[PDB]
DNA sequence: CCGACGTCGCATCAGC
DNA sequence: GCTGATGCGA
DNA sequence: GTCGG
């Protein structure tokens with residue numbers, strides 16, 4: 001990409017701040033600057049040129065000048081050499097190991113893939129499954145495989161109850177040619193913002209997908225969110241497909257547009273859009289858009305009849321999902 | 327200068 | 343058990 | 353780390 005060296009550098013800094021420094025606002029700031037630079041349609045010639053973009057300030061402009069001049073950033077050259085940061089950054093690549101657990105594992109002398117496998121009983125359930133599929137979860141999913149997965153999920157959901165609607169969101173809904181995982185939004189007319197007239201609505205779908213051996217493992221599961229593992233079936237003599245991460249979110253049916261806006265993302269798009277909502281006097285979550293009083297307290301939910309209704313409230317022109325890959 | 331930075335589900339733990 | 347952080351994830 | 357009041 002046009003500015004890929006710069007955006008990779010800022011992403012690596014973002015990850016350092018999240019995983020090692022445990023500085024969540026610096027993580028978000030670096031990711032915001034990387035995103036706005038990734039969409040900038042010119043090859044950046046200087047830090048000052050980048051500083052014009054919102055989210056790029058003085059410090060990143062200086063790093064961009066060092067990176068343009070040398071092809072490298074000394075700050076990151078040193079981070080790469082620090083064994084503690086190297087260890088923590090590896091360990092946090094296991095699903096379920098976050099910055100806190102990674103640093104505690106390092107204190108205990110658990111710092112390598114071999115150390116983790118030797119100490120499975122020091123892992124919670126999520127982490128144990130993250131370790132099992134460590135290699136698989138860094139592989140990307142071709143859209144062609146996403147389409148096969150979509151067919152299975154949609155048809156199995158229809159067999160449980162033809163009134164379910166499952167919608168694949170995430171980068172797939174933004175039209176990406178490959179995805180890191182599969183995100184499924186689920187609705188049923190029995191579950192609305194006003195009542196839950198039938199229990200186990202998510203459970204029944206999960207159990208059906210386990211029954212046909214599509215869902216293979218569970219990371220976490222509650223009444224409205226499933227986080228787990230799935231796998232396409234392979235044909236005779238074929239090597240098996242990698243196991244994939246799957247997330248299923250059951251959303252009140254009358255709140256589908258706020259739910260599908262949220263689950264379509266990207267994550268940075270959502271942060272930018274919700275931050276703009278706040279500046280406009282609204283707050284948006286996956287359920288509603290509500291006004292803010294002078295209070296600072298959220299009012300009653302506003303009527304939403306399309307994704308574009310949400311954009312309208314905050315005075316944004318509509319952006320199709322394919323234009324939300326921030 | 328400096329307060330705010332998106333919003334929330336599930337797992338886990340501490341305190342009572 | 344309940345409640346309220348905290349961690350980790352979407 | 354950046355921004356806006």
Ligand SMILES: Nc1ccn([C@H]2C[C@H](O)[C@H](COP(=O)(O)OP(=O)(O)[C@@](F)(Cl)P(=O)(O)O)O2)c(=O)n1
Pocket residue numbers: 169170171172178179180181182183262263264265266267270352
């Ligand atoms: N911090 C987050 C993370 C996710 N999300 C929402 C938006 C996003 O599209 C996301 C789906 O989560 P995921 O991490 O799978 O993000 P994707 O957009 O699907 C992806 F592009 Cl990173 P992919 O999963 O395809 O690699 O849920 C969010 O709002 N905030």
Ligand SMILES: Nc1ccn([C@H]2C[C@H](O)[C@@H](COP(=O)(O)O)O2)c(=O)n1
Pocket residue numbers: 165166167185186187253256
């Ligand atoms: N998972 C879903 C997807 C769509 N829908 C409903 C919301 C709208 O009334 C209707 C329109 O379909 P679509 O917008 O997906 O073209 O589908 C739902 O209730 N649950």
Ligand SMILES: [Cl-]
Pocket residue numbers: 285287288
């Ligand atoms: Cl709400």
Ligand SMILES: [Mg+2]
Pocket residue numbers: 170171179180181182183
């Ligand atoms: Mg995804």
Ligand SMILES: [Mg+2]
Pocket residue numbers: 330331355
């Ligand atoms: Mg602000």
Ligand code: NA
Pocket residue numbers: 050051052053054055056057
């Ligand atoms: Na700027």
Ligand code: NA
Pocket residue numbers: 091092093094095096097098
């Ligand atoms: Na992790």
Ligand code: NA
Pocket residue numbers: 170181182183245246247352
């Ligand atoms: Na996901």
